[PDB]
Design a binder for this molecule. Sequence first.
Ligand code: CMP
Ligand code: MG
Length: 640
Amino acid sequence: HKHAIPANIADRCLINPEQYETKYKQSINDPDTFWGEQGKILDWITPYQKVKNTSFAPGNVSIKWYEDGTLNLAANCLDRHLQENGDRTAIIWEGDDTSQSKHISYRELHRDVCRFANTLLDLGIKKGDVVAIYMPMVPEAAVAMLACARIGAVHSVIFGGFSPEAVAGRIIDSSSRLVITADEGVRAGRSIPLKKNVDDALKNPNVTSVEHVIVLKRTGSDIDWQEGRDLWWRDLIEKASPEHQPEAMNAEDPLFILYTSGSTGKPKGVLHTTGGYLVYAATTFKYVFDYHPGDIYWCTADVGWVTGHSYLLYGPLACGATTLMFEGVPNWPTPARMCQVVDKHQVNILYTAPTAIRALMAEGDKAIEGTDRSSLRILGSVGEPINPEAWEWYWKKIGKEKCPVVDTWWQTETGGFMITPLPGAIELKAGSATRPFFGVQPALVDNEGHPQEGATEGNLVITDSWPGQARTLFGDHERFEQTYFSTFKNMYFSGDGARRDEDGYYWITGRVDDVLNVSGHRLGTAEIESALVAHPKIAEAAVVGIPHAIKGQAIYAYVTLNHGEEPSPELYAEVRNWVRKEIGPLATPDVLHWTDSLPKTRSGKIMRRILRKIAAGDLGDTSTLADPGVVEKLLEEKQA
Ligand SMILES: Nc1ncnc2c1ncn2[C@@H]1O[C@@H]2COP(=O)(O)O[C@H]2[C@H]1O
Ligand SMILES: [Mg+2]
């Protein structure tokens, strides 16, 4: 069942089916001409000559785009829009409480970003310095990010739900010089203690690089204050000059670092540079959401994740869009909140997550009760697999069967959309990302790296570079090469599995490595295991994801206790909270399963496949296990 392109969309679309085919073919056969022309979506201070200069060679990965060009991201997202569109709203802010909202014009946003860029410079922050941003969804988070970009500082945004330990780890790895935070965040009526978490992070003796903490007064709560180190946002920004001249950055100057979980090890700082990244974010934003001047756009993703970088802020602001930043959650105070915001601000494009869609869908018509939704024209889904039922419920109930849904597949390491419909070019299948974006060459390979042709399934790789590609892991280019470019030589390995059907449409089925996706949050199996075994009473741990009707995956942990310890309600609570402390509430196990029967190879390594099946409630081949006998026991313990 393919959904046709509706006439209202065909009448206005930027890219129709023929235009998609022609552009795609040029983008693959001649990326230098294609991207040389498409790069002019940005203002360049000096033009590039060389466009594509890349190699996925084993142990010798090198990625450069537009390398001789110079530009400024903040000038592209702000300054260049002033003369004609200074009075256009850049950010609509909607508070957690519906009585609270703000409209911030391109001129107002520009003025505050200039003031804060001057604030950063005056504090001694320079081009290349890393600035940690630990902020709630308020416009000042955007001001901070844009001001860093404006001066060539490298921001590292840390999701507000991370624990003090997790904050400290990111600060340590990045040598962040400055932390920007708020006293508290406000979410679903509740307060989250951000500044206190920062205090606790900075007590880590290995945190040595932070000289100041800028604090936004969001709630005015009683916080501890360290004289000298801590500074109030308002105090600083009101002192600063609103005049700031943007300087030119090289296309390959680092723009930001975003700490990202892997199949093994601890989170690594995925690094994006400036030129290719912004070209790709602007281009994908424009064509996939069919952006026309005047369109009101709402991405629901947090600023702390890559969607919040590329599609809440940089893509839409580069294009001069009005972008909506919502402080709260889609179902507070009631399940109808998301569609109430749509109505309130006459949103035309809605881009949200399958977990959110499923949480609303569980409430049924209470999600749309009393709302109109007629301003919507385009819908999109981000960040995790979406099954056909949820897709159809979204398309029907939120979009009233009138709105194409763009199910966008991409990753933190890809910078922007990779496989996605375009609303006026591609007919839709519920649950399918459909076809690759311009400049993207996907392939499916078996475990031996052999490309599979026709209708088939396998490991999803990308066989050549694209302008938005992450360039490295901060301080760890060899691990970058290992993780993404060693499994299948000369290819980018996404870590995802996919199916291609007889029409050539792609269906992404989930991670094939040990990365979990819990409510849209990317977590590592090994890092959660490491968190658990750090507990004084825990000897060993094996973590698996299991299907969950709302969250997509839930976290199931098998735990082996030290000799002398017994399970108890106290210990159950303590271990769950231990993971909440080491990483954050986002990584809290849903289930703890106490056992002494972890399956292991004869070399001693944990075997997780059977554990996954058992936890799911299901078996496989046990001939690699040093003791098959564990299986039966594990089946009994889960029965109880
Ligand atoms: N539309 C989608 N369908 C299936 N999987 C997705 C989709 N979008 C993102 N993902 C995966 O979910 C992961 C979440 O973290 P990342 O964005 O880093 O990388 C992402 C992809 O591997
Ligand atoms: Mg221990």
